[PDB]
Amino acid sequence: MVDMMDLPRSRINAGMLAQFIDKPVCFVGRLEKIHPTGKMFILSDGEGKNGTIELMEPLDEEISGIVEVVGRVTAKATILCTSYVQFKEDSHPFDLGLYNEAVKIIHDFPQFYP
Amino acid sequence: ISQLLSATLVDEVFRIGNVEISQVTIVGIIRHAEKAPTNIVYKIDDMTAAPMDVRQWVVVPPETYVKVAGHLRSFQNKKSLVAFKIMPLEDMNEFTTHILEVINAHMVLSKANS
């Protein structure tokens, strides 16, 4: 076993979850809902699709908006989150459609983006 | 950071692929930092390889995105960066633009050398 923090974490959207099972991934989305026990939530990407986030301990911090999480793709087409961070949008909005287009670009020609 | 650690060292000037580089800039998230009487070292992570090291001579708190520009160094065959300046992002679209800037830059020169 090796720590996932020191691996090439990929960046993807909700729609690609079916082809990256068990590998580390990086997910960007806007918060949608929180399971009432504070142990699950769901994010959405530019296309509007959704992916679920699972955790290990209850969350004592309220989180909303664009969310940044990293984890391992489980067998249920889900993300087993290890860490999360939330951007700052206090002065500008995040053009999430532009980021989705950029992410679509990376996997089109990975030679220039190893 | 994925392509920096893969750079060759010849006659004091580092090369990547078919292009030379001496001054570079990247964007990532701080992971940890320590204080020294003469300089500071940050572990900048951009989620495509292990946290690189950047050194600045005489502090941004952790988990913050930043943009850096500096020089590439090798010491005991270990890659590192010496940074002229480090600036936290304010608009979060900067790194989304940077992701496309990188693919444009490291793709335009390739055909020129062809």
Place this chain on the structure above:
Amino acid sequence: NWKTLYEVKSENLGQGDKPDYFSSVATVVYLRKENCMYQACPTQDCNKKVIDQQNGLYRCEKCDTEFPNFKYRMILSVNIADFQENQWVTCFQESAEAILGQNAAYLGELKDKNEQAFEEVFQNANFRSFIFRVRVKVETYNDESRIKATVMDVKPVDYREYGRRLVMSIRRSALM
């Protein structure tokens, strides 16, 4: 009109007999810290650098008058670099005050009152990115022909449209 410094230097720009204008985005690398400010005439317009009379009074040759006060002004030479090339350009008060994020008089006071802060201004302004509108023309001096570049406008960057243009160029260019 979108241009790249490499194409500017390699597509026959500025070599003509007329001042050509172009706009591009690039990062500021170096700022000339000395020989930037020259005392100027209190009148509203004069294409003349005042001359000192060494008695608390100044004279202007173009208008042939004398006043007891002078106005500071800015001429800045700066190097702009991109992912493929670099270029030298010169900035007057309008663009210089934008890039330095200060007015001419305040910087003039600072240089003669606080030199460390004067340097820090250039330091902070260094490595920033702006959208540059520049014009280039050939000037003949002592029988040498060379291109001089002057900055028209300085503004911050449009990240969204910049990314849209980049992605459109990438998709279009590759598929050719």
